[PDB]
Amino acid sequence: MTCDKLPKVPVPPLEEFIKSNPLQFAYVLTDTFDCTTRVYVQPARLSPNQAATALDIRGSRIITNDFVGGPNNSAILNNCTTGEKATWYFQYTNLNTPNGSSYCAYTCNGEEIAEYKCANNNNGTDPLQKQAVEVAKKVPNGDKIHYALDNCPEHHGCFAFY
Amino acid sequence: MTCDKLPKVPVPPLEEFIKSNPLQFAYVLTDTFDCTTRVYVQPARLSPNQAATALDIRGSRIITNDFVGGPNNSAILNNCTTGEKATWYFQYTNLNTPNGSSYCAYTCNGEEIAEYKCANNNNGTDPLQKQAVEVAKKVPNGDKIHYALDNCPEHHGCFAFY
Amino acid sequence: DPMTCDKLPKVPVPPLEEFIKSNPLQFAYVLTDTFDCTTRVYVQPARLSPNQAATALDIRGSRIITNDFVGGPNNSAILNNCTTGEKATWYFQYTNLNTPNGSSYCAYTCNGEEIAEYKCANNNNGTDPLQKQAVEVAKKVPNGDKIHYALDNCPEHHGCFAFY
Amino acid sequence: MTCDKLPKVPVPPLEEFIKSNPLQFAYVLTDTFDCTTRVYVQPARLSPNQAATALDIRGSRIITNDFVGGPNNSAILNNCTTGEKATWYFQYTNLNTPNGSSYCAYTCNGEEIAEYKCANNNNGTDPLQKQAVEVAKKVPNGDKIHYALDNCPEHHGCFAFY
Numbered sequence: 001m002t003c004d005k006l007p008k009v010p011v012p013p014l015e016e017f018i019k020s021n022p023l024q025f026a027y028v029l030t031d032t033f034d035c036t037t038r039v040y041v042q043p044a045r046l047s048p049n050q051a052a053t054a055l056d057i058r059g060s061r062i063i064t065n066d067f068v069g070g071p072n073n074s075a076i077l078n079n080c081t082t083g084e085k086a087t088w089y090f091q092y093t094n095l096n097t098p099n100g101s102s103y104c105a106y107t108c109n110g111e112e113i114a115e116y117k118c119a120n121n122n123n124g125t126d127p128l129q130k131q132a133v134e135v136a137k138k139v140p141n142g143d144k145i146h147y148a149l150d151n152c153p154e155h156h157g158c159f160a161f162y
Numbered sequence: 163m164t165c166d167k168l169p170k171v172p173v174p175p176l177e178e179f180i181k182s183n184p185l186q187f188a189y190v191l192t193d194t195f196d197c198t199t200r201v202y203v204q205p206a207r208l209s210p211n212q213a214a215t216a217l218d219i220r221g222s223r224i225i226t227n228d229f230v231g232g233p234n235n236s237a238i239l240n241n242c243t244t245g246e247k248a249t250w251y252f253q254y255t256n257l258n259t260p261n262g263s264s265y266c267a268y269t270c271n272g273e274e275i276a277e278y279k280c281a282n283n284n285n286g287t288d289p290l291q292k293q294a295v296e297v298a299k300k301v302p303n304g305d306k307i308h309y310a311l312d313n314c315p316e317h318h319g320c321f322a323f324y
Numbered sequence: 325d326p327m328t329c330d331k332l333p334k335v336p337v338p339p340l341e342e343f344i345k346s347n348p349l350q351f352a353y354v355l356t357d358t359f360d361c362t363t364r365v366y367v368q369p370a371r372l373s374p375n376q377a378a379t380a381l382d383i384r385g386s387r388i389i390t391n392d393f394v395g396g397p398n399n400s401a402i403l404n405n406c407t408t409g410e411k412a413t414w415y416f417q418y419t420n421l422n423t424p425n426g427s428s429y430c431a432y433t434c435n436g437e438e439i440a441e442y443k444c445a446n447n448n449n450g451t452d453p454l455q456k457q458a459v460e461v462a463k464k465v466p467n468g469d470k471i472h473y474a475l476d477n478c479p480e481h482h483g484c485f486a487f488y
Numbered sequence: 489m490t491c492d493k494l495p496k497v498p499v500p501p502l503e504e505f506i507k508s509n510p511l512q513f514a515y516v517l518t519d520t521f522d523c524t525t526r527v528y529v530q531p532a533r534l535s536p537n538q539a540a541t542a543l544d545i546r547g548s549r550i551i552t553n554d555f556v557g558g559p560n561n562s563a564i565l566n567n568c569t570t571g572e573k574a575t576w577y578f579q580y581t582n583l584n585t586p587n588g589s590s591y592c593a594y595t596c597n598g599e600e601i602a603e604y605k606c607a608n609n610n611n612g613t614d615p616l617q618k619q620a621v622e623v624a625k626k627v628p629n630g631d632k633i634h635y636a637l638d639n640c641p642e643h644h645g646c647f648a649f650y
């Protein structure tokens with residue numbers, strides 16, 4: 001019921017995320033991540049630190065964050081444009097089931113939730129995702145968590161991009 | 163000698179491209195693909211057509227194109243914002259060698275080259291890439307082909323994105 | 325250097341007289357194909373206009389698109405399409421009007437962080453160095469890859485310099 | 489009473505016409521210039537001949553004519569689309585009074601009036617315009633001269649254009 005107290009499941013291996021690509025966010029907190037597709041990328045061959053990268057794609061705009069594993073099943077995201085760091089966790093993951101992939105992740109401002117991202121590739125049918133969203137919405141600031149896919153731009157022949 | 167007569171090698175399996183991710187374009191024709199990172203994405207689980215997607219990323223800007231195989235070792239790209247189609251070929255591919263990946267790809271305007279993209283993840287050291295560029299530069303419009311990675315924006319903690 | 329449309333420069337809108345003294349201009353770079361082969365003429369408000377909105381005329385042969393405009397906050401102009409009633413909020417990336425080498429500017433309207441339309445006008449055959457740097461910057465924002473040179477393969481004139 | 493004998497007042501300086509912009513035609517002869525707004529444009533900076541241009545605007549359509557001074561207080565118009573020439577005169581002008589601007593202009597087919605255009609930006613209140621029209625109507629073919637602004641298309645937020 002406070003953000004610091006939410007579940008922290010192990011971060012799955014990178015290949016599980018790459019196999020899930022692409023995902024879309026069904027629920028988010030700030031309207032930044034509305035109408036958004038997530039793609040995970042392995043580190044560049046010549047990258048010395050070997051950090052993987054999350055791509056958050058909204059139409060023709062992309063947000064990029066390198067990420068590396070931290071303590072307490074955290075990931076630390078490095079905004080590629082800004083240099084800003086955030087500590088993220090998974091509330092749960094459920095990748096590459098026979099009904100597809102879902103997960104919900106979050107980052108905190110102490111006991112409040114600063115950002116929330118629930119991703120899937122199965123149109124929101126995972127029963128885990130339903131229960132996770134209910135829990136998150138009761139954490140302080142969680143009232144802003146909303147369905148992210150309601151009035152999105154029309155497509156021009158691509159399924160996952162517009 | 164003319165664009166319509168350039169080599170057209172078989173398109174590698176999608177897995178070989180995804181294993182190469184991310185790449186950058188070392189040589190391009192127009193200014194569009196300067197300072198750009200390419201990421202290949204598989205089709206969304208629920209996509210009926212199962213077209214894969216090419217992501218061309220330059221800072222906060224992304225250009226997206228679904229692609230499918232066509233005749234004569236072609237790929238037909240569908241621009242995801244416009245629905246415009248372009249027929250592309252590979253001049254050569256050399257993916258996932260012990261020295262990394264490279265390829266050069268092109269699209270024609272009759273006998274002229276309209277666009278050219280040479281990708282790698284090994285800082286331009288594949289000897290195939292140098293010979294391919296020297297050939298393409300001699301095709302009509304090919305004089306515009308240029309090194310694409312001078313004076314690109316500075317990074318903020320990520321190796322492959324900015 | 326600025327990475328999204330919402331972050332582009334917003335210079336002060338010059339007095340309308342500076343635009344009218346620049347008439348007519350042509351668009352060298354645009355985003356959609358609507359404003360290819362296009363000449364711009366600025367018109368003061370009609371004497372009897374209730375709101376004193378000036379008008380931008382975008383002329384392409386025998387066709388015209390018209391937008392009333394008025395000043396808004398943050399150096400914006402709010403445009404009112406006279407045919408449709410559609411409104412849009414425009415800014416100037418830069419203006420360089422009435423120099424000893426003529427006039428140029430680049431203006432834009434955003435769809436949030438993407439550029440929705442772009443219009444680089446001049447009357448000096450695209451020689452202003454500001455215009456080159458501006459175009460390069462605007463192309464790099466989301467959707468800016470569509471910005472193109474607008475004056476290739478336009479219809480032949482019949483004896484008028486600026487209209488066809 | 490004959491078109492060739494109508495008054496031919498001096499063509500005012502272009503600046504006086506530009507200061508009057510925009511005008512509308514209250515009376516015209518043919519159907520062509522019903523529901524029409526007139527805007528005058530100076531020559532382009534790079535025009536070698538330095539001819540100004542009259543813009544006749546009717547919704548989304550425009551007729552354009554460069555014009556230059558000729559003998560007898562004439563203007564010679566050059567249609568920018570068709571190349572057609574016509575010799576025009578002013579019956580009177582009354583630009584930039586404290587009650588706004590009006591004028592009446594004409595072109596002849598010998599003794600007949602071929603086209604007539606009375607412009608104003610004061611809703612037709614200049615007494616000169618009334619007397620001019622009554623005179624022109626008595627010229628051969630002047631029976632066709634009519635009020636031009638009756639059943640005009642509805643507007644969408646602009647005063648002078650639709």
Ligand SMILES: N#C[C@H](O)c1ccccc1Cl
Pocket residue numbers: 022023024037120121122123159160161206207208209
């Ligand atoms: N598979 C799947 C989802 O339907 C989807 C739709 C649009 C964009 C991305 C995704 Cl994953």
Ligand SMILES: N#C[C@H](O)c1ccccc1Cl
Pocket residue numbers: 044045046047184185186199282283284285321322323
């Ligand atoms: N590996 C590698 C390359 O150096 C590189 C640098 C920057 C962006 C992408 C790539 Cl592939």
Ligand SMILES: N#C[C@H](O)c1ccccc1Cl
Pocket residue numbers: 380391393400401403414415416431432443
């Ligand atoms: N459309 C358009 C113009 O080029 C413009 C840009 C910015 C402010 C006003 C105007 Cl009319």
Ligand SMILES: N#C[C@H](O)c1ccccc1Cl
Pocket residue numbers: 348349350363446447448449485486487532533534535
């Ligand atoms: N002055 C000038 C330009 O060359 C020009 C050519 C054609 C139409 C308009 C303009 Cl401004």
Ligand SMILES: N#C[C@H](O)c1ccccc1Cl
Pocket residue numbers: 542555563565576577578593594605607
């Ligand atoms: N109204 C009118 C005429 O067509 C005209 C246009 C420009 C200059 C002179 C004249 Cl008479």
Ligand SMILES: N#C[C@H](O)c1ccccc1Cl
Pocket residue numbers: 370371372373510511512525608609610611647648649
């Ligand atoms: N001022 C004035 C006139 O009433 C007018 C109305 C509509 C279009 C143009 C003009 Cl000048």
